[PDB]
Symmetry: D2
């Protein structure tokens, strides 16, 4: 009766109970999926958070910037799901851009070392995760990444927008590779969601004007979205990621599904 009954899915990106990945994982488990979770740096925090999910799931360490973590990932994942078992789904819910590349800091003042760390984690890592997990993925499988529509320039998002543009391009290429395994690669372009970092930004953490600009963006989103947009609810986004992990979008790859209330299709 579950949308993902008997599916083995890797879910990365859980840091808090407000992370999009926390809701992707919760909905996937509600839908019968058996999960493997990857965490970065704060493994003690991630453990106490992931324990509050509907079901038990092994937690593995994964710094996408660590080439040893990536090289050992498939072996570690196979150990957690059992020899002879493969993944049906992979969720990349990873994004990061240093403070110099987002907020009130002038767009021209982001040092390249920072932008490069940001593009490494936010875009390149999508291809790294794919390279590492495709050898242990089943035909009919699904790789899903989290995107924020970068088609147009926005205030404050700055170099994260640039990283999303790179991620969109990476995805179309990952799909060419994924296809050889009978696996789909897609992105979910979500509307803005109130994660801990996002509430902090809106509160003025990256400067006041950045907070005010994002608040206008969030307000405008809901105004344009024909069915509305509730940034305080990550479940519609999580439900969309599950739809892509399911067998119900079998002919969609190298693509982007917009879980944004339809705001991107409206000007005013």
């Amino acid at each position: 009766a579950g949308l993902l009954d008997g599916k083995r899915i890797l879910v990365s990106g859980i840091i808090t109970d407000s992370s999009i990945a926390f809701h992707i994982a919760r909905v996937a488990q509600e839908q019968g999926a058996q999960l493997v979770l990857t965490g970065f740096d704060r493994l003690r925090l991630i453990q106490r958070i992931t324990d509050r999910l509907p079901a038990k799931a092994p937690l593995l360490e994964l710094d996408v910037q660590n080439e040893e973590h990536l090289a050992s990932l498939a072996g570690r994942v196979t150990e957690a799901i059992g020899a002879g078992n493969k993944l049906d789904g992979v969720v990349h819910s990873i994004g990061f851009m240093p403070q110099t590349g987002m907020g009130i800091n002038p767009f021209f003042d982001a040092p390249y070392a920072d932008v490069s760390k940001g593009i490494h984690i936010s875009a390149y890592s999508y291809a790294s995760m794919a390279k590492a997990l495709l050898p242990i993925m089943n035909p009919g499988g699904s790789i899903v990444g989290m995107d924020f529509d970068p088609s147009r320039a926005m205030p404050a998002y700055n170099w994260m927008t640039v990283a999303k543009s790179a991620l969109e391009s990476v995805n179309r290429f990952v799909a060419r590779e994924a296809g050889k395994y009978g696996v789909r690669s897609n992105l979910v372009a979500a509307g803005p969601i109130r994660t801990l970092a996002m509430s902090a930004i809106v509160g003025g953490a990256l400067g006041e004007e950045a907070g005010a600009q994002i608040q206008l963006l969030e307000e405008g989103w809901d105004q344009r979205a024909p069915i509305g947009w509730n940034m305080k609810d990550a479940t519609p986004v999580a439900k969309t990621v599950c739809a892509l992990l399911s067998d119900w979008l079998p002919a969609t790859t190298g693509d982007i599904i917009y879980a944004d209330g339809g705001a991107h299709t409206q000007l005013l």
Copy 2:
């Protein structure tokens, strides 16, 4: 258990067993949906074809160019599904373009009366179907239309491509209206499907319709079987479900990913 369990869906566009709508209806019924089918002109042919679907479904007449058929549609639909029952889903799988606007006929030789009939049936009727069925649709509902990616010009499709461009624009506006009812409006841009309209209605056209399938399969990272409408039908059901709840005025590409690749 099914993806569309206890959902009341209207499905238009069944003419043959090869119609995309025939497969949309078959998959929806396999998925627990209770259907209402609309048909055009050849109602005797349609009833016979639809009797081959997995389950019984009332068949209603609908010429989208007939303003009386549209004006009475909701009342007729309510009669078929029972008073106090509303639709959860609407499938617009309607397209037509006279021969002068699609094929070997030069793009410049399509008379406007023909292009106009084509845009009426292929684009404007998407808004007509919504106007007529939104009053009898439930919050959480879904309106789904069939599209063929018109972003770039292509040989033979000519004015049907122009009509698809109009349909995509109509859809974004239908979504503004649909939203007031808590209903989503979206299109499925399918890869080419060897429906009879495709082969039969649309010289060495045999190798032409074979080559189209082959070229598309190459571009598609996951491939493309022009003889198989089921992946398209599954994508339509995904939009009719509760699993794409924040997607409206949009296009989902059920094309194997061909549109995302240059070669």
Copy 3:
């Protein structure tokens, strides 16, 4: 010294001194072009307007819905420019949508007979003009149409947006045809300009809420446009149309140049 020195250009769409076509024609003449002007219905009004252009230009009647006017157009144009002379440029600055298809009238209440008149004049006519004038056009030539970005739904524009979406598609096809003559076909997607009809709309002619919605759109345009947007100045749009009529965009066809202050590239 003129961008269009010794070029023979047909310019359609002059109705008032505020028409985009009036400024396209004025800039083209300032740039050395020899013009042929087409007018619709109000030929007495068009004559007294076009007389206030920098130079004399023959005025011909053209109702794009009249198949006789179209069938005789090339012959009439050849008569005005002289036997043995051909056009180097064609400007389609024609658009119309009945009141039922624009404004506060509900989108669902536009009768098809009206939408059809609108798509006939606004989209189909681009291909009609091309069909009629390509036989009398020189290699290196340029067909230019006026567009308003229809990528996203907007309030009030309603069925005119639908017609622009059709026009964009028509253009890509016209370019396939035009190419056989060595002629380019493109559109200029202009930001909103304060023509007589537009000021009337903003004033509340198609209902108050439509006027208010358009005023917000115009305000937002200038806000998003990185170089600003002055709807009261049609010269930047006219200069863009001339750029496409010139030999300086020789490898651009079936395309759209955005003379919108760059507003379409910015979200907020």
Copy 4:
């Protein structure tokens, strides 16, 4: 009389007589522009090549990865054009992607250190050039970068396509900055050009680079000559002129119209 009469334009990216920048510079000078040229690494080779341009132009060193070169650029440029003079135009014709990220090497085998060098030179440097030259640019000015349409994935281009996608995003942001100075920022998405970087830097690669030209010419309604950079160079000059005054954060396609057609 010329399209760029009395305009002071910086032109970067000349390495050979086949470089797009060599033709951009030649056409700009033919059009009355007074140029400042920037070169990377092989300055002896570049000075010799640029001595073949229609007119004398000072050549300055610029490694876009060198923060000292960038920090001193405006001061060095002002010295070459005279105190009290500012730039009206800037041409960024810079691109690089190590072999691991472009060609037969599998997409998954490009080390990040290489992709990062590529994105630094190909995308980030567009913003670096603007940061450095906007303080010495005149209102009405123009910043123009070279792009290759990255909307869809394509064989061999791999991570350079990823870098072009980043460059298009960078451009929209550079335009927000540029706008404060009354300066436009735009990209020219060119069709393929048989520059040496193209043929030489990017087995049966001879028939590969011939077939690319032929396929593109078919798709292009007006055709495409891969051996002719002049139409691209003319499009760059159009953006550097005063004839596209309301276009910024945008892309002009100098590809013969190939991107607007599916076949």
